[PDB]
Amino acid sequence: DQICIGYHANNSTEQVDTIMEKNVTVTHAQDILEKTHNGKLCDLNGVKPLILKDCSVAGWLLGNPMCDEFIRVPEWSYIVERANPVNDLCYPGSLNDYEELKHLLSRINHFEKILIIPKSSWPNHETSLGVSAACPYQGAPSFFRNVVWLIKKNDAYPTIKISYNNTNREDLLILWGIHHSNNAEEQINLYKNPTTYISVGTSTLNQRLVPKIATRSQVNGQRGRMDFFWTILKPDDAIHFESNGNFIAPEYAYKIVKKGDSTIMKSGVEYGNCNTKCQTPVGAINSSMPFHNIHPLTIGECPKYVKSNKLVLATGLRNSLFGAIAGFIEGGWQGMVDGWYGYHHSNEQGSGYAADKESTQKAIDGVTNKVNSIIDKMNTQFEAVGREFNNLERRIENLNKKMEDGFLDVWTYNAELLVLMENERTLDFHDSNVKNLYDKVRLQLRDNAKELGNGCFEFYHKCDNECMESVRNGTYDYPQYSEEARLKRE
Amino acid sequence: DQICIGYHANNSTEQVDTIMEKNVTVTHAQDILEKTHNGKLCDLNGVKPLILKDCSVAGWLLGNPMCDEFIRVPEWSYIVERANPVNDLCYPGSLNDYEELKHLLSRINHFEKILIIPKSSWPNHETSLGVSAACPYQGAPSFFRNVVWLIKKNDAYPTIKISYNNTNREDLLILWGIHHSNNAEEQINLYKNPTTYISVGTSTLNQRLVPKIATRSQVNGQRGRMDFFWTILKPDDAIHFESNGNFIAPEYAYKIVKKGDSTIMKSGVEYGNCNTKCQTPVGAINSSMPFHNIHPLTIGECPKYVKSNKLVLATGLRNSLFGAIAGFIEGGWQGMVDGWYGYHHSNEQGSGYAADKESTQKAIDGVTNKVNSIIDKMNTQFEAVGREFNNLERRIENLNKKMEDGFLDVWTYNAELLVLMENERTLDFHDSNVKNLYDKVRLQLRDNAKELGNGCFEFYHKCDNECMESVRNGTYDYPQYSEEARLKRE
Amino acid sequence: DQICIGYHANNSTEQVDTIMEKNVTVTHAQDILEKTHNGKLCDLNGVKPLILKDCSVAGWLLGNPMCDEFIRVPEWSYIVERANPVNDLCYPGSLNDYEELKHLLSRINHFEKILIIPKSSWPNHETSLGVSAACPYQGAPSFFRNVVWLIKKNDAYPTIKISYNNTNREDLLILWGIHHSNNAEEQINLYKNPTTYISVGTSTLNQRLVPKIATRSQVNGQRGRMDFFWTILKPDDAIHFESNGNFIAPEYAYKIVKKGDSTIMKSGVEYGNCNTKCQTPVGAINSSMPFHNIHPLTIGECPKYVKSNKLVLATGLRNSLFGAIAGFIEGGWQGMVDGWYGYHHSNEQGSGYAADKESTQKAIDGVTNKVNSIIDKMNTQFEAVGREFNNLERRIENLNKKMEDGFLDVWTYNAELLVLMENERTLDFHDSNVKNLYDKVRLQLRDNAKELGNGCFEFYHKCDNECMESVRNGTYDYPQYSEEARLKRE
């Protein structure tokens, strides 16, 4: 007749890591790392992204004739740009402050293209010959569609003076440019006037552009260049243009109607007619996990990114330090299904495994609260944001990279170290709960049984099946059976 | 006759937190998080801040007529600017490198304004007509006070050639500007010469400015603009000006006399006739706490800033795992008052509580060192710093924000998780102490007493007051009571 | 007859620190902090650094005559520049985008200088008179060696139009400049033409420079100035120059022939004819430690930098929580040399110390895995990178300093805290191992021996050497001796 104290065992092969031991097989564990993605671009909470295909942001905004698909865009959730878009600037040149514009686009969800300067507004200039073979449409020379390349009419280019007063209640993004002619003859053939300028003024802009007539290398078959500029025209302000040549004038502008969180994503994976709450450039995530290792650059409600390949929290015991688990109790009980700790009883009346629901719920509550506390502390982590730099901005670009990679390393260490330390603490917690139950039965039985040291108490007397129950309840009468044990001794 | 091992209990209501359990009621605790402020701006270590009221830094340095109170400014400890000061550049335009200038002022505590170019130096130019209705003073057109808007005199504007040599040993801040006229007629009416320039040279400066005569929107009633510039003139260098018009000459310049720690605080909170060692834009801090959650931007000897709402360290024990505290000892004793651990005796002469000074003093040292160690580990933390950016520096501004918020989240997690883990260890430390003291007494008594299971030992022999003390003294003589206890065992 | 449990003791004075206690003398300990350096500059894996001595990067690349030593530099590992080099721009002026050029250079291991435009390319210009006493050589006026200050010939300066196509298959760094003359007479005396320009154009570059003819302060005896500019001509692109004066033409250019890891170190420390794998501006490191506190800016396979003065890991035991070590055992054993824990026996055959191999090995494996896990987690620490900023870039310079200092503080805290926390656990780990060993012999001997409480068990029977061994072996035969012990009892 004997009562035993033991712990759960099963056939779980899930492993966890600790500071002192790797690949410790536990009865119960919880993965906290998401490692899977649907491999496709999806709508973000019902709203489709804007996929520019082979067109860049500059080709869309200025109206590269190969980008007609986006002459009018519905509202987007985010913008997808392929890494090296073919249709960028059909006519060689530049777009000033291009990275500051992209940063501004990242906080905009909808444009409305409005005509602000009709071509009828230029009665004394030519508005139909401003085309180039560098900007082909259907094999024929063309140009950007949102601006107009004005040239001379009847061998004259009168001085332009025009003002647009923004009458909408939303800000307007407006683009214009300057053409850099190739030589003094071409300068005259196009604009007649040999010494030209472009003036642009608002309440804050005070720009003067002068053509640079020089020899340059051919790009897209052209030695000329076009330098484009942009501004944000505030609701009740006006923009004033003055030019005697080389003016690429605004025709259409963009009314910024919806502002909100967005990003310009560099991805080439295809749209998949799906919805998600979390998008990465490699694919969407559907997960309640607190961590993921898919990609740093995400948008939406996402898990926290880590470079970890494994993040598994030990919730259960060591499968088959305080000296109980794998100590004087050498192995787990597979026949014990309910509860994490309990007793095995043996007498003439019967035999069976009985769980200690009191000690078990204490352990489940603590183990569960630890998992919740761990998840809660990682709500506020560093999240990378898309910042673009140009070729003479390589120091701040490198500072950016080192900062974003720095924080990511800090949080990767924080997540992996916390799991290791608390896994160790959790295993030691189960070991302590078993010994406290072994000491609960002891100091209650006393010399009514000999403690064999294997976790069992060999009763010198005999126990009813209800006798074993009373100790499991926590109340047991030592004097009632004190007499039978003395005779059994010797 | 018995002796019991037990621990402290009081009417404390303080709650601390651990990884497994929230809201644990302990007997003693140490809050480390200051959460209150006086809601006012104050002097810093006896030095008043420079409150610019509604004047910008630009308005003070150039000398907006609305800023005349700041003509002579005493030494300051920090500068207070409203978020949108209304007295800023009364004549529209810009101040070049204004954020870089604000950055220099953050390391400056006092200027000495000096007259470097008197109006008598302009005998062939008009010095009393450079006024505008955009810069009103007392119901008449006026102008910035520290610069001079020079005009043609007798319908002439002879070329200016002037040098100022810094003969002071202090660095000199000098400001000048250019006026952009509105059309060719106004250019003649103001400065007879139609084609003008400003040249400015030092040992490192080589600047040429040319007015931009174009049409702009009216701001503060003016379609003109004034662009201002600045430089620091080293102690033996000279600045050389040449101009045939549109020149806004210096008159007064600022000698940097005191360099040190200061900040451009942004706040509209009022001055409260107070002194502090620690100042935030929402209020001043008077605390010895190691942490605060008032505001990231502080100046002076301040606590470390965290986003936490609660940061309370456990120092005492759980109020009313090794298995003693709330284990076989069901609860603490209110009647034990001079220590955390001790004994309760009961004999024929009476009863009473006694604290074990040895074990309580060891636990006090360990708990105090843990508190001190945690404060010391938090000595070096991220300190947010005011850095300013303009409308086309939003990428770097966004970089700055994410870095300062990212370090804040890292150190907030560190503070909170360390308090959680160390609070758990502290409670288990108290529980272990009590078990080791229980075993210490169990070691002396052996079979001369009985282990009840609740922390008490029922003596088999008679133990008077001197014998009770010997068990507390650690000098219990077992052989002196051997036979009586053996007789009582029957 | 008697068997004791106890633990190792030695003559160690090594001390570790814990959260609750500092300066704990432990039996064995592992330093993880490197604190020493040879105070010299060395080759990096057999490659000698480029030591510019008193020449700046600008003086080297432009070819300041006082830098001739660096006319043909072999491949380097890192570049060493003094903090304030004396031979910088001998003719005063600037090098544009200098900090960005230094950032490109920090990723370059070898230049091959080539002659791209020889002086024969200038038949109608004077090529021997472009010298200055600001750039002495051998007591006579000279000039930068890689660039040609062209001058009028026969009182004429024909317009220069030249193109260079990069026919090499590697990137080409090209430099050029513009001379700002001092007045209209000097302009004519040097270039005949009063109104001059320089145009430069590539596939991406479209630059126009115009002399600024103004009064400036004398620097190195010159009121004039030279502004220099650079570009990277890609392997099949062309650069086009046009000018009618003030042009400082390229002569030699630098082919980028090896790209690689490198850095521009600021140091006055001497080369010492040494080799290293890890270099620091104050000295070289020869070390296998995982952490060092020498300097944040290193190059090579280096330890991770912290601000700590001490980082020592407890690997062994407290020297002479669970209540065994310095508890009921109360002291270590000097006679016990072959393990951390074990037994001292005493019988009629003699006495002697013996170690428990199993419990010692289990502790050796755990502590070794602890040390390795701590080192492994700190492999991805922040690595500071040298980044230079000019006088009007003080905001981003401060942002940079704060970021690198903030990560340094974060990772210093992580190291000190993890060493503190794991040290405390390790000492407890040993305490628990001793107790579990003590309780292993207990529960096996049972009432066949008496429990002294000082760690020893007094046998009530005769335990010969094999009986003593069976206790260490775990094969004690309880029934064989039971009657002899009950006979000795009472």
Ligand SMILES: CC(=O)N[C@H]1[C@H](O[C@@H]2[C@@H](O)[C@H](O)O[C@H](CO)[C@@H]2O)O[C@H](CO)[C@@H](O[C@@H]2O[C@H](CO[C@]3(C(=O)O)C[C@H](O)[C@@H](NC(C)=O)[C@H]([C@H](O)[C@H](O)CO)O3)[C@H](O)[C@H](O)[C@H]2O)[C@@H]1O
């Ligand atoms: C072109 C030139 O040498 N100008 C010097 C000027 O000579 C003029 C003369 O050519 C003309 O015929 O007559 C007028 C008067 O009607 C002038 O006399 O005379 C100045 C003084 O009167 C010179 O200034 C002295 O220049 C010094 C520096 O000498 C160097 C130098 O070492 O940098 C001499 C070099 O040969 C010369 N470089 C070249 C390529 O010709 C340079 C060059 O002139 C400057 O670097 C360009 O700014 O100057 C000292 O600066 C001294 O203080 C100053 O008086 C004119 O240099």
Ligand SMILES: CC(=O)N[C@@H]1[C@@H](O)[C@H](O[C@@H]2O[C@H](CO[C@]3(C(=O)O)C[C@H](O)[C@@H](NC(C)=O)[C@H]([C@H](O)[C@H](O)CO)O3)[C@H](O)[C@H](O)[C@H]2O)[C@@H](CO)O[C@H]1O
């Ligand atoms: C009007 C015209 O065609 N003038 C002759 C040039 O065509 C010719 O230079 C050639 O130009 C080629 C590109 O031709 C376009 C273009 O960019 O596609 C055609 C456009 O009609 C024209 N646009 C305007 C407003 O005139 C455009 C324009 O002239 C340039 O873009 C201005 O920079 O050129 C191609 O580049 C060839 O390589 C080139 O030879 C020149 C020289 O032969 O003579 C002109 O009469």
Ligand SMILES: CC(=O)N[C@@H]1[C@@H](O)[C@H](O[C@@H]2O[C@H](CO[C@]3(C(=O)O)C[C@H](O)[C@@H](NC(C)=O)[C@H]([C@H](O)[C@H](O)CO)O3)[C@H](O)[C@H](O)[C@H]2O)[C@@H](CO)O[C@H]1O
């Ligand atoms: C063209 C000209 O030189 N003068 C007269 C115009 O100034 C005037 O335009 C009006 O000017 C108004 C503001 O008038 C001031 C001002 O800024 O307050 C008055 C100043 O005395 C004058 N300053 C100087 C130094 O001469 C100032 C100055 O001309 C401008 O700043 C130069 O930019 O103008 C106000 O803006 C009105 O809305 C504007 O019409 C016209 C019309 O009255 O007559 C001109 O002769």
Ligand SMILES: *[C@@H]1O[C@H](CO)[C@@H](O[C@@H]2O[C@H](CO)[C@@H](O)[C@H](O)[C@H]2NC(C)=O)[C@H](O)[C@H]1NC(C)=O
């Ligand atoms: C821990 O203690 C705090 C109270 O000090 C509890 O916070 C309040 O809980 C009630 C609902 O139970 C809310 O209505 C209050 O708004 C909470 N905040 C207060 C009073 O400041 C908290 O819920 C407790 N947490 C647990 C797990 O028991």
Ligand SMILES: *[C@@H]1O[C@H](CO)[C@@H](O[C@@H]2O[C@H](CO)[C@@H](O)[C@H](O)[C@H]2NC(C)=O)[C@H](O)[C@H]1NC(C)=O
């Ligand atoms: C500003 O004033 C000082 C004092 O006159 C000038 O420095 C002196 O210049 C003269 C002639 O060049 C020398 O003889 C003195 O030895 C110089 N004294 C000192 C302390 O430098 C200085 O040249 C002037 N600064 C400028 C840019 O002209």
Ligand SMILES: *[C@@H]1O[C@H](CO)[C@@H](O)[C@H](O)[C@H]1NC(C)=O
């Ligand atoms: C832990 O388990 C995985 C998969 O079985 C294995 O790849 C890995 O090598 C194991 N780690 C160790 C230390 O054995």
Ligand SMILES: *[C@@H]1O[C@H](CO)[C@@H](O)[C@H](O)[C@H]1NC(C)=O
């Ligand atoms: C644009 O029109 C509105 C309405 O009259 C007017 O208030 C405003 O001043 C105009 N803005 C400019 C820059 O002319």
Ligand SMILES: *[C@@H]1O[C@H](CO)[C@@H](O)[C@H](O)[C@H]1NC(C)=O
């Ligand atoms: C607890 O006891 C102290 C002293 O008796 C008393 O000052 C205090 O008010 C009490 N606190 C509470 C919450 O009752």
Ligand SMILES: *[C@@H]1O[C@H](CO)[C@@H](O)[C@H](O)[C@H]1NC(C)=O
């Ligand atoms: C401590 O013991 C070791 C073993 O011989 C010895 O090498 C060392 O020098 C000793 N140190 C002192 C201070 O005795």
Ligand SMILES: *[C@@H]1O[C@H](CO)[C@@H](O)[C@H](O)[C@H]1NC(C)=O
């Ligand atoms: C620890 O040891 C060092 C060197 O012996 C000593 O400087 C320091 O004062 C000691 N610290 C404490 C708390 O005793």
Ligand SMILES: *[C@@H]1O[C@H](CO)[C@@H](O)[C@H](O)[C@H]1NC(C)=O
């Ligand atoms: C340089 O020479 C090659 C020869 O193939 C030519 O293809 C190339 O276009 C030239 N580069 C320029 C900018 O003309």
